[PDB]
Design an enzyme around this catalytic site. Structure first.
Site, PDB file in Angstrom:
ATOM      1  N   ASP A 302      42.980 -51.838  10.795  1.00  0.00           N
ATOM      2  CA  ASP A 302      44.128 -51.837  11.720  1.00  0.00           C
ATOM      3  C   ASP A 302      44.185 -53.108  12.567  1.00  0.00           C
ATOM      4  O   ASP A 302      43.299 -53.335  13.423  1.00  0.00           O
ATOM      5  CB  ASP A 302      44.112 -50.567  12.584  1.00  0.00           C
ATOM      6  CG  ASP A 302      45.470 -50.226  13.193  1.00  0.00           C
ATOM      7  OD1 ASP A 302      46.523 -50.691  12.695  1.00  0.00           O
ATOM      8  OD2 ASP A 302      45.572 -49.446  14.166  1.00  0.00           O
ATOM      9  N   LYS A 351      46.839 -43.973  14.157  1.00  0.00           N
ATOM     10  CA  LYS A 351      46.908 -45.057  15.160  1.00  0.00           C
ATOM     11  C   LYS A 351      46.279 -44.758  16.542  1.00  0.00           C
ATOM     12  O   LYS A 351      45.532 -45.597  17.075  1.00  0.00           O
ATOM     13  CB  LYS A 351      48.366 -45.509  15.328  1.00  0.00           C
ATOM     14  CG  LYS A 351      48.520 -46.719  16.220  1.00  0.00           C
ATOM     15  CD  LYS A 351      48.175 -48.036  15.501  1.00  0.00           C
ATOM     16  CE  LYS A 351      49.213 -48.390  14.434  1.00  0.00           C
ATOM     17  NZ  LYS A 351      48.674 -49.538  13.656  1.00  0.00           N
ATOM     18  N   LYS A 392      57.814 -54.979  20.658  1.00  0.00           N
ATOM     19  CA  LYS A 392      57.113 -53.824  21.293  1.00  0.00           C
ATOM     20  C   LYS A 392      56.795 -54.104  22.763  1.00  0.00           C
ATOM     21  O   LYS A 392      56.630 -55.263  23.173  1.00  0.00           O
ATOM     22  CB  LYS A 392      55.899 -53.279  20.485  1.00  0.00           C
ATOM     23  CG  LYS A 392      54.517 -53.728  20.903  1.00  0.00           C
ATOM     24  CD  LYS A 392      53.823 -52.760  21.861  1.00  0.00           C
ATOM     25  CE  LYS A 392      52.310 -53.046  21.912  1.00  0.00           C
ATOM     26  NZ  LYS A 392      51.542 -52.380  20.817  1.00  0.00           N
ATOM     27  N   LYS A 462      41.172 -53.396  14.943  1.00  0.00           N
ATOM     28  CA  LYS A 462      41.090 -52.468  16.062  1.00  0.00           C
ATOM     29  C   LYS A 462      39.948 -51.523  15.918  1.00  0.00           C
ATOM     30  O   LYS A 462      39.285 -51.197  16.911  1.00  0.00           O
ATOM     31  CB  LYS A 462      42.310 -51.584  16.133  1.00  0.00           C
ATOM     32  CG  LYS A 462      43.406 -52.114  16.968  1.00  0.00           C
ATOM     33  CD  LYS A 462      44.346 -50.966  17.331  1.00  0.00           C
ATOM     34  CE  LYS A 462      45.717 -51.536  17.605  1.00  0.00           C
ATOM     35  NZ  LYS A 462      46.407 -51.991  16.350  1.00  0.00           N
TER      36      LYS A 462
END
Ligand SMILES: [Cl-]
Ligand SMILES: [Cl-]
Ligand SMILES: [Cl-]
Ligand SMILES: [Cl-]
Lengths: 511, 511, 511, 511
Positions: A302, A351, A392, A462
Site C-alpha cells: 500500500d 485500507k 484528496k 504503508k
C-alpha cells in the site's frame, strides 16, 4: 562527472563492483544484574552489477488514475513537455521520487568548506523512469488518453500534448472477480478474460508476461498492482499457507483465491517480480514461499503517499522528543475512482488496517512514555466526496501529553494530489527492485541475493511486508537511512556522518 | 539493573570509562572527471567520568515564566506532587526532556525477538533534574510563589502545594540596562544592582557565582540566560571581536556591552559554563575566544521549543522525500511577558532572525530541487495577544511543489504551552553540559575536552552557535542522532542499527 | 416574465414608480422607573425612475488586479466565454455579486406550497454589469492585456480570448504624488500627468470626465478608486474640514492634499459620484460637504471582500447566540501588487484600522456579555508573500467564553482569490449608486434624493462612511436586510416575512 | 427599571397584556406575464399572561452529561459559585442562553445618540433558569454528584461545591427497551421499571408526572428528552399514523413503540409539554395529533449546539452573498457517553439525517446559484474517540464556487464543549415553551393558543418539526428574527429597525 570511489575494499571487474562492508551490530544478553551489550563486526562482501538491465513494468490497473499518470509523466519527461499557467510555464519533472530527487550526505569537505550532498542516483547506477517500458492490464478498455480525461490529473493542455502517445495505448483485458472489489465497479468492467477457470486465467497472464518480455527483449520484468483495492482473502492451511496449497487452490478453482493472487502467481512463475501497491493481503505465506522458491522479489503493501507518510515522520519526531501521543484522529475525503471503491466496507477495511498500523513499533520503542505499551486512541476515516476528485483532503488532529501533564495539540490540513503523490512512488518501487535484482553478497563462498521479501521498499509503503520473523519498521526517516546507508555501502563509501565529531574535536590522523 | 558493556575496546579504571571508537569519515577530491571519495578511519579514545558532579544552575530571569516553572517542576517531581483534574489526577513528570525520556535504538535481540530501546539516561550516567541546585537573578524581586501566580502555568492546586518551597525564594538583584530590552519592562524592574559602572557590575556577579559555588560546595556551575530577549549589540573590532577587546570595553564602560555580555563574562571568569536561551548575540567572537582561553563551554542561541522544533523536523522530511518547499509562513501569538517584550521592534528582530534561519542547510543540501540554492518565501510573525497568555498559538502554512508541477499545501495549528515546552529544555541544556564537562579524548598523548562552543546542544536550540569555521546543522532528527551516537560511542556500543541488514540477509559470522 | 405589484399605494406614471411606505419606528424616553418605548409610523412617499440610465464607470487604478479583472469579466460575460478545465469547461459568470445573484424572500405561496424567493435584480430595475461602459486612469501605461498577465487572475486560455478586447485599452495618465503610497511603486509609474500644480491636476481630471461623459453620451458617471492604498492625510480646520477649505488648499498647492482627494473633487465638480474602495480617508468632512453642496453621492471605505466579510457575519451570529468573543486574531498573506504596497507601514495602517473596526457596534449592542463595553483582544496582520500571489490566505482564531466559563475556540483557514472577490463588489457599488441616483422621497411637498453619503453601500465596505451624526453598522447580514427591505419598499411589496406567523397560527382575514 | 410600552394598541387588564399587531404579508398569483404580488395586512390581537407560571422540568436522561450539568449550573447560578483558575476566578453564569443573554434591537435614540439594545428577557417576562424545578428519569441510578464525576464537565472544585445539592438527587427508574439504543448501554442500565407491558409503563410515568406536579404545586410541567439517541421507529398506518393508532399499539404491546414514544404519550395525557432533544422520530403524526387533541405543545428535533449552529448561519451568509456551496464536509469526534452511543449504526443514522438536513431550504431559495436545485456534496461523520471526552472536535471543509469559476475554500476547527453548549439550550427550550403557554391570539372572537407543534423553537434545534403542511426553516439568524419580532409584537413595540432609513433621509413627521 561521475562519483568515483577510492578504496582498498572495492574492486571493479567485469562491470560489477565488489564492496566489502564491516557491519557494526550489538548482541545482547539478559542477566540478573542487567543488560549486557556486546558490539561485534560482520564483514559483508557485496557485488553490484553496475549496468541497469533493460526493464519492463506491467501495471495492474494500467488505465486508472495512478496508471495513466505514471505512463503520461514518463512521456512528458522524455519530451520535456511544458504547459501554460497563470504564472508562466510549468515543465515535466520527477519531483517526489526519492530515487530521482533525494540527495544523500557523504560528509564535509574542507577545501570547499561545504557539506557534501549527492543525488541518490549518483551513488549506485539506477534506472531513470525514462528507461522503463510500460504495459499492463485493465478491466476497462478505455485508451490511456480517455483514461487521462477520466483521471483529471494533468491540465487540459498537457493531455493534448500527450494524446498521440497515450491514445494508442489500450490495456490488455484482465481477471475480474466481482466479489473481490466494490460492487460499484460493474459498469466499468468491459475488458475481461472470459470464463471462470482460474488456472486458465493463470495461464493467460503468464502468456501476457512472456510475450511482453520477448517483444521488448527485457532482462527485468516487474509486475505492480495499482488497480482497485480488493478485500482480504481468508488465510488458512488448506488454502494458501504454503506454495503447494496456493497452486492447488488455483487448480481446483477455489473461491478465496483473488485476482491479485493470480497476478502474483503469474509473475513469480515467469521470473517477474511483484509489487502490491494496495491494502489487500495478496502476499499470503504461500505466496512468499513461492517467491522464495522461484528466486523472485515481492513487495507491499500500500503506497505511502500522503497523510500516512507525514504521520510516519511526525509520530517518530514526537516520541524521539520525549512526547506521548494520546489521541490520533485522521479524516480523509476524495472523489476519484479510488474513493468510490473505498465507499464499500470490506475495501475500506483493507485500507483502514494499513493506515492505522504505523505507530506500533514507535509506541513499543519507549516504555517511559508508554509503560504499558498501550497505543493511543487512533481513528482513521475515508469518505467518498465526488467534488474534490483526485485532490484528496487529509484532516488530522494530534494530541500529545508533554511536561507536567500539559498538553500539545496539532491540528493539520493537507491537500494531497493523490495521483501526483502515488506515481513517483510507482517509479521508485520499480527502480529499487531492479537495483536489488543487481545486488548479491557472500553467504558461504557463493554469492546470494537478498531475501525475496524486499523490505527496503518500506519507505514507499504503508503496511510493509517483511521477511518472516523480523520486525516491521514504520518511521519514514528511519526507512530512508536504511536505504541510503545501503547504497553507500554498495558504492564503497558509507560513514558516521550523522555524527560529525570533527567539528568539536581535533580529528585524529587517519589509520 | 544497569546497562553493561562487553568490549575489548573499553576499560574501567578509577570511576572513569575509556572508550576507543573508530570514526568513519569520507574525504573528498574534486577532479576534471568528477568527485573522488576516499573513506578513512579515525580512532578516537574517549574518557568519560562516570559519576555526575554536584551541580548548581544559575538562571538569569529566575523569576520569569520559564525560570519559576523550571524550579517549580523540580520540586514537584522530588515530592511526586499530584493535582485533581476533571479526568482524575495528574502527577509531576519530566516529559519533553530528551535526556529524561528519549529512548535510543541499540539493535535487535533474537532471544526476545525484539528491537532494543533503552532510555537515553541509561547509556552514560547523567544528572536527573532532581539533582540540580538552582538559584539566579531577576530585575523583579517577586518571590517564586508570586512568580508562579504571575506566570499562570501550574494549575492553582499545584501552586499551593509548591508554595512552602517556592515562596522563600527571592531572586538576587540583576544588571538592568533599560536600552537593551523592550522599554515596557521599566515598571517591573525593582531589584537592580546600583550604579552605571559595568566593571563593578562584572565583579558583583562574579561575587554571586563564587558564593553559590562555595555555599553548596558545587563541582559544576552552569549559568543560563532565560530573561527577556535583549536587542543585538554591534559587533566590530575595538569593541568585542577579541577577548581583550571585550574586557577592555567593560573596563572603559562602553555602551554596546549588554547585561548578557557581563553575565557571560562573569561566568567564564569564574569557571562556570554559559548557556544563552534567548535570541540576542551574546556569544560574540570576543566571548567565544574568552571561553576558549578559560576552558569553559558556551551554548546558544534560543530555545527550540515549539513551532521551530516542528519546522526543523518537517522541512527535513520534505526535502528528503524529494519535495520543494516554495512558501513557508509562520504566525505566532501569545500573551505572556515573553510576548509583551517581543511587542518591541529590536527585540522582535533578535527572534525573527533565529526563527527564519532553520531551512538554510537543507536548501543547500539539494541542488536538484534548488538548482540556484534560493530559499523559499519565508515569513515569521510574532504578536502580543494578552488573552492566550502562556498558551502560544503557532499558525503555519507550508506550500511545496511536488511531481509534475503539482502542489501540496499543509496548513497547521499548534497549541504551545511555551513554559511547559521550554523548562524541560532548560533541564536538558544544563544536563548535557555537565556531561560534556566529563568527556575527554586523545589529541596527542594527552587528553583534551571538546571545543568550548558546544554545538551538540543544537537539538535544543533554534540558532545554534558552532565552533568557528564549521557548518550549522538545523534539522532536528539529524541533531538527535549526533547526540545518541555520541553517547553510545562513549558507553562502548555504537552501531549501524539504522540499517539492520540482518533482516534481509544471512548475517556473516562475527569477526 | 416580470415581477408585478398589485397595490393601492403604488402608481406608475411617466416611467417612474410612486410608492408609499409606512415606516415603523420606536421612539424612546428615559425615566426614573425605566425605558418608555413609543411605536410611531412615518409615511414615506418614494419615486423610483424605472429605466436605468446610460452609465459610465471610471476606475482609478484601471490597470490593477481589480481593475483589469473588472473589465475582463464584463467582456467575458458579454460574449459568454468558456475555458477548458481538468473538469470540463468553465463559463463566464457574475457570482459573488449581491445585485446579480442574491435572492430575496417575499413570503410563502399556498398554491405552490412554496417559499417565494426572487432575484434581487427583479425587484426594482437595475443595471447589469454588461451595461457599464468603463474607462479610467493608471500611473502604469500597460494595456489591459499586459495588465491581465500581470495580475494572474484569469487562466491563460481566458486571457487569450479576452486579448482583442483588452489589449486596445491603455489607461489615461494619472496624478502621482510619490509620498502618498508605498515608495516601492516608483518603478511602475510611467504614465503620469506632468507638473506639481494640483489645481492644474484638478482641471485635467475634470477634463477627463466631461469628455468621457460626452464621448459616450452618459447620463450617470461614477468614479471609483481601486488604485493602491494611500496613507491618511492630516485632518484639521485650515486644510480640509470644510468644502471651501479643501478648494483653497488645492488652489494654494497644499501638501496634505492627496491624489485621491483630487479625484474625489474632480468627480463631484463634474456631477459624477465617487466611491472609495481603499482604506485611505479620502472622504474628509470638507469633501462630504462638497458632495452635499453639489448633489452627488459619496461612498466608502474599503472593499469588504474576504476575511472581514466573514468576520462581519460571524461575530454577529456569536453575540446574538449569547457568546462573548474574548480574542480575535486575523493573519493575512498575499503576493499581488496590493500586498507589495501594504509592505509599507503608513499604508498598512490605512488597512489595519478598517479591518480592526467591525466589532464595535456589536460589543456595544450587548451589555450582559460586555458590561464595561471593552472590545476583545483584536489583532490584524497583513504580510507580503510573493508566492501565493492573488490567492490571499486568511488565517483566523476566534476564542469565545460561553456557558459557565467554558471556552469555544474556532480556528479558520480561508483561500481568498482577492480579485475574484473584489470585482463583483466593484460592479455592485456602481450598480447600487446608479439605482440610488433614481430614487427620491417626499420631504415637504417637493421630492428629494437620499443623503449624499450613501451608507446603504455598507454591506460592500469594511469601514463604512455614514451621514454625519448617525451610527456605523458593521454586521453584514444586517446590512443586507437594509438593502433588501429598501428595494421591496421601493417596488411596493415589503413585509414581515422574517416572522411568518401564518405557520403556527390561523391567519386573520385581510383588512 | 423595567421596559414600558406606550401604545394605543396595548392594554393591561388583570395581569395579562393585550397587543394588536398588524401583520404585513405578501400574497401571490402566477400569470402568463409573470408574478403578481399583493401586499395585505392581518390584524393579530395577542394576549400575554405577564406572570410566568410555577414551572417544573422533567428530563429523560437526568443523570447524563447534559442532564447533570443542566441541574448543576442552576444551583451554581443560584448560589453564585466561583472556582479558582490559573487566571484568577471563574463564576457561575448563563452564557450561551439566547433567552438569558441575547439582546434585541428596538431602534435608535437621538437624545443619547445611541442604538437601543435590550435584553431579550426584558421584552416579555420569562422564567430565569433559577426558577425551574427539575426532576426526571435515568436507567442509571447514579446520583447527580457521581453523575458529574462521570460527565467531566465542571472543574473538580465546582463539583465539590455542588456536592451537597447534587448528591441527594437520584433519578427515577426509567423505561429501558434495549433494542432502541446502542447495545453498548446494557452495563449502565440498573434503574429500570420492571415488566414488558408498555401500557403499565405508560401508566407508571403518568404517575410520575402527576406526583411531581402535585408535590411542588406546579402550573407548567415540561418533559424533555436528553437521554441516548434511540433509533427511528417504523412509521405506517396501523401503528402510529394517528392518535388512536398510537394508543392502541401501546395497549396491544406493539414492538415498534419506543421508550421515547411512551414518555411523549405520558406527557401529553398529563397536560405536560414535550421536547425532543435527540435525533429520533418520536413526534410521529399520531403523536402530533395527540398533542393537538390534548392542547399541549410539542418540540424537536435535536439540539443545535455546535457544528450545525455554525453551519446554519454560514451557509445562509454564503448564499445571501451570491456564492454557490459545492462541497460541505463535516467531521466530528468525541469521547463522552453520547459518542459511545453513536458508535452504533442505527443511532448514528438518527443523527446523520438531522445534521445533513440544514441546507435544503437555502439551496431552494436561490435558482441562479442552484438552477437545478441540486444540493452540494454533503458529508457528515461522527466518531467515538474516548480521549477528547466531552470536548467534541468539529472539523469542516466548505468549498464554494464564486465569481468567474474561481473557488473559495474555508477550512474550520471548532472545539465544542458539548454539555456546556447543550444545557443552556435545554434552559431556552423549557423557557420559550412556558412563555408560549402564556400567549393567545384572536381566531374568531375567542382566543386561541399557537399550533401545538411549536416551531418557534427552531433556532435551538437541528431538525425542526413544524406544523403539518408548512416549510422547515433552517437558517439560524432567520430563526432568531422570528423569535425577536414575535416577542416585540407581544410586548407592543415591533419595528422596521432592520432598515433604519432615518439615517439617510429626513424622517417624515409621525402620523
Ligand atoms: Cl527532476
Ligand atoms: Cl518522567
Ligand atoms: Cl450569473
Ligand atoms: Cl448571565
Amino acid at each position: 562527472k561521475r562519483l568515483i570511489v577510492e578504496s582498498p575494499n572495492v574492486k571493479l571487474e567485469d562491470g560489477v563492483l565488489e564492496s566489502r562492508f564491516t557491519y557494526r551490530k550489538n548482541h545482547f544478553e539478559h542477566r540478573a544484574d542487567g543488560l549486557h551489550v556486546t558490539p561485534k563486526e560482520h564483514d559483508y562482501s557485496f557485488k553490484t552489477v553496475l549496468k541497469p538491465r533493460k526493464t519492463g513494468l506491467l501495471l495492474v490497473g494500467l488505465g486508472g488514475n495512478n496508471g495513466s499518470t505514471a505512463v503520461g509523466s514518463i512521456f512528458a519527461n522524455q519530451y520535456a513537455m511544458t504547459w501554460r499557467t497563470k504564472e508562466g510555464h510549468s515543465q515535466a519533472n520527477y519531483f517526489g521520487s526519492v530515487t530521482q530527487t533525494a540527495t544523500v550526505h557523504l560528509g564535509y569537505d574542507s577545501a570547499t568548506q561545504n557539506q557534501i550532498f549527492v543525488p541518490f542516483k549518483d551513488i549506485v547506477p539506477i534506472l531513470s523512469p525514462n528507461d522503463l517500458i510500460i504495459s499492463g492490464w485493465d478491466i476497462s478498455d478505455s485508451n490511456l488518453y480517455e483514461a487521462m480525461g477520466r483521471a483529471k490529473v494533468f491540465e487540459p493542455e498537457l493531455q493534448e500534448k500527450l494524446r498521440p502517445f497515450m491514445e494508442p495505448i489500450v490495456p490488455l483485458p484482465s481477471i475480474y472477480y466481482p466479489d473481490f472489489i466494490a460492487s460499484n465497479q460493474g459498469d466499468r468492467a468491459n475488458n475481461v478474460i472470459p470464463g471462470d477457470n482460474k488456472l486458465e486465467h493463470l495461464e493467460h497472464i503468464r502468456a501476457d508476461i512472456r510475450k511482453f518480455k520477448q517483444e521488448h527483449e527485457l532482462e527485468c520484468v516487474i509486475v505492480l498492482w495499482t488497480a482497485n483495492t480488493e478485500r482480504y482473502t481468508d488465510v488458512r492451511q488448506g488454502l494458501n499457507a504454503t506454495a503447494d496449497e496456493i497452486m492447488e487452490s488455483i487448480r481446483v478453482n477455489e473461491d478465496e483465491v483473488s485476482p491479485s493472487n493470480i497476478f502474483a502467481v503469474a509473475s513469480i512463475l515467469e521470473g517477474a517480480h511483484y509489487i502490491n501497491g494496495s491494502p489487500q493481503n495478496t502476499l499470503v505465506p504461500g505466496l512468499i514461499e513461492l517467491a522464495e522458491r522461484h528466486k523472485v522479489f515481492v513487495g507491499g503493501d500500500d503506497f505511502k503517499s500522503g497523510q500516512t507518510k507525514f504521520k510516519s515522520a511526525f509520530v517518530d519526531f514526537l516520541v524521539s522528543s520525549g512526547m506521548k501521543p494520546e489521541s490520533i484522529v485522521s479524516y480523509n475525503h476524495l472523489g476519484n475512482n479510488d474513493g468510490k471503491n473505498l465507499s464499500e466496507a470490506r475495501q475500506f477495511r483493507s485500507k483502514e488496517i494499513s493506515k492505522s498500523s504505523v505507530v506500533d513499533d514507535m509506541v513499543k520503542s519507549n516504555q517511559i512514555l508508554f509503560p504499558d505499551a498501550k497505543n493511543p486512541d487512533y481513528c482513521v476515516v475515508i469518505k467518498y466526496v465526488p467534488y474534490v476528485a483526485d485532490s484528496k483532503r487529509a484532516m488530522d488532529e494530534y494530541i500529545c501529553s508533554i511536561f507536567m501533564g500539559g498538553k500539545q495539540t496539532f491540528v493539520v490540513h493537507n491537500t494531497c494530489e493523490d495521483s501526483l503523490l502515488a506515481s513517483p512512488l510507482i517509479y521508485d518501487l520499480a527502480i529499487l527492485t531492479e537495483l536489488a535484482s543487481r545486488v548479491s553478497y557472500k553467504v558461504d563462498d557463493e554469492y546470494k541475493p537478498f531475501h525475496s521479501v524486499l523490505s527496503i521498499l518500506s519507505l514507499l509503503l504503508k503496511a510493509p511486508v517483511v521477511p518472516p520473523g523480523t520486525p516491521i519498521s514504520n518511521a519514514f526517516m528511519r526507512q530512508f537511512s536504511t536505504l541510503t546507508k545501503l547504497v553507500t555501502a554498495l558504492a564503497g563509501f558509507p560513514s558516521d556522518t550523522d555524527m560529525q565529531i570533527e567539528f568539536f574535536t581535533q580529528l585524529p590522523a587517519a589509520k
